[PDB]
Symmetry: D2
C-alpha cells in the first residue's frame, strides 16, 4: 500500500468534493504548481486549495476527476485522470459557454517529506476548447 | 434545415435507444462502413443494430452530446461527444466497467432527403486509454 | 529478442520503404484488417501489400511510420506508432488536400502460427482530419 | 489582407527560422504569455525571443511550426498550428529523449496598438509526452 498514491487519491477526492480543510495533511508547505502562476503567488496548502476552488467555480460544483491509473517511481507519482465538467465560470478571459466537456489529464507529482511538493498537470486544453465550441476570449486575463 | 433536423433525430436515437421510427430519416440503402466488421445489413435495420450495439457495449446510459453541426449541399458534418461506460464486449476486449468520453466527427450524405451514407470517427485512442488499454482476449 | 516484435517491425518497415516482396514471411495467409473492409475483400499478404501501396499513394512515398514503443502479451502485440505524410491522393471521397499531417496510432496485432493473423489499427482520424483542413467529401464513392 | 494575420504569420516564421532580430516590429512592448511564467519574468519582444530560443534549444534547430489555419475576430487572432520537433534539450526536468514528435497547437493572440499584446498557446502536452515515451522527470528543478 503506497502512502504516496494514497495521498494522490486524497488530492483527487478534494477536486471531487471541493473540501480542502485537511489539505495540509498531504500538501507540502512549499507546494508549487507552475500552472497556477498566472492566477496567484500563493504556495503550499493554500495554493492547492485555491486550485480546487477555481475548478468548482469554473467547471461547476459537479465537476468530477475520474481515475484511470496511478503509478509511482521513487519519490514521483504519475496520475492519469479525466476531468468532467460544465463551463460555468470565466476561464482566462473567456465568458462561460455553459458547455459540457470531458478531458483526459496527466499529472506529475514530486514528494518531499512524504507530502506533495511539486505538481504539474496537463489538461487536454485543445480537446476541452473544442467541446466548449471554441470560444473567442472577451478580455485578457 | 431538414438535413440538420434529421441528424438531430439520429443523435436522439442513440440517446433513447428508440429505433422504431428510424425509417423516417434513414435511407433504405443506408450504409456505414464502420459496421462492416459486424454485419451485412443495410438501411434502417443497419442503423438500429448500430444503436443497439452502443447501448449493449457502452451501457443504456451512453449518450451523444452535440458540439456543432454544419452542412454543405447534401452533406452534414456533426461534431459530437460520446459518453459511456464499457459494460459489453468491445471487438474482443472484455468489459472493463470503466467510464469514458470521446469526441466524434460524423460525415453524413443525404439522398432522397434521407441519410444514405454515414461515416463516423470515434476517438479510438482516447477511449482506449480511458478503458485502461485492455489487451484483447480474442479476435473479433 | 521477441520474434513477434521483430515481425511487427518488419511490418512497420514495409510501410516506410514501400518494399513488400517478402510480406508472406510474416503476414498470415488469413490476415485480416477490419479497417480496410470498405475498400477490398482481399486477405493475407495480398491485402497487406495493397494496404501498403495505398498508404504510399495516398500519403506520399515519403510517408513515415515512426515507432514510439511496442509491447507484447502472449500472442498479442500492441504497437504505438506515429504516421507522418502529405495528403496527396483521394481518401474516402475527399479530394487531395496537399496537407502535411502527423497522427499517433495504436495497433493491435494477433499472431497465429507465428504470423500476423489479425490487425486492428486506430489512426488519429479526427486529429488528421483537422490537419487536413477538415475537407468536405466530394463523393460517397471511391470517386 | 489582414495586418493582424500577417503579424501572427511573422511570429510563426520566427519559430521556424529562429531569426528574431526584428520581433519588435510585431511584438508589443508589454507582450505577455502566461505559459512562460515558470521560466522567466520577462515581458515584450524580449520574452517572445526567449520563447523562440527555448523551442530551438529544447526541440532542435530543425523544429517547425506548420500552419493549419488562422482566423480573426476584431482585435483577436486564433492560430491553429502544428509543432514538429525532436526532444534534444531538458524539458521541465525531463532529460532529452532524442525522440521525434509532432503535436497540434492552438494559439490565441490579442492585439493592442497593432502589435501582439497577449499570447496564450496550448501545445498538445499529453500527445507530445506519449511520443517522448512518457519520461519520468529526473528533477523538479
Ligand atoms: C487557480 C487557477 C487554476 O485553478 C486554473 C487552472 O487550474 C486550470 C485548470 C485546472 C487543472 O489543472 O485541471 C483541473 C484547467 C484548465 C485551465 C486552467 O486554467 C484552463 O485555463 C483551460 C483552458 O484555458 C482551456 C481549456 C482547458 C483548460 C483547463 O482544463
Ligand atoms: C521560455 C520557455 C518556454 O518557451 C517554454 C515553452 O515554450 C514550452 C513550449 C513552447 C511552445 O509553446 O511550442 C511552440 C512547448 C512545450 C512546453 C514548454 O514549456 C512543455 O513544457 C511541454 C511539456 O512539458 C510536455 C509536452 C509538451 C510541451 C511543450 O510542447
Ligand atoms: C454494430 C457494431 C458497431 O458498428 C460497432 C461500432 O459501432 C463501434 C463504435 C460505434 C460507432 O460509432 O461506429 C459506427 C464505436 C467504437 C467501436 C465500435 O466498434 C470500437 O470498436 C471502439 C474500440 O474498439 C476502441 C475504442 C473505441 C471504440 C468505439 O468508440
Ligand atoms: C485500401 C485502402 C485503405 O486501406 C485505406 C486505409 O489504409 C486507411 C489508412 C491506413 C491504415 O491505417 O489502414 C491499415 C489510414 C487512414 C485512412 C484509411 O482509409 C483514412 O481513411 C483516414 C481518414 O478518412 C481520415 C483521417 C485519417 C485516415 C487515415 O489515417
Amino acid at each position: 500500500r503506497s502512502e504516496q498514491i494514497a495521498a494522490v487519491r486524497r488530492m483527487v477526492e478534494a477536486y471531487n468534493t471541493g473540501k480542502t480543510d485537511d489539505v495540509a495533511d498531504y500538501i507540502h508547505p512549499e507546494y508549487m504548481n507552475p500552472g497556477t502562476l498566472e492566477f496567484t503567488s500563493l504556495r503550499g496548502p493554500e495554493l492547492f486549495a485555491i486550485n480546487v476552488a477555481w475548478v468548482k467555480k469554473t467547471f461547476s460544483e459537479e465537476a468530477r476527476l475520474e481515475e484511470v491509473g496511478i503509478e509511482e517511481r521513487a519519490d514521483w507519482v504519475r496520475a492519469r485522470l479525466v476531468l468532467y465538467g460544465r463551463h460555468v465560470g470565466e476561464m482566462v478571459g473567456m465568458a462561460p459557454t455553459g458547455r459540457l466537456f470531458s478531458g483526459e489529464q496527466i499529472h506529475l507529482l514530486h514528494f518531499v517529506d512524504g507530502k506533495i511538493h511539486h505538481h504539474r498537470d496537463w489538461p487536454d486544453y485543445q480537446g476541452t476548447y473544442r467541446q466548449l465550441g471554441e470560444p473567442w476570449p472577451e478580455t485578457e486575463h
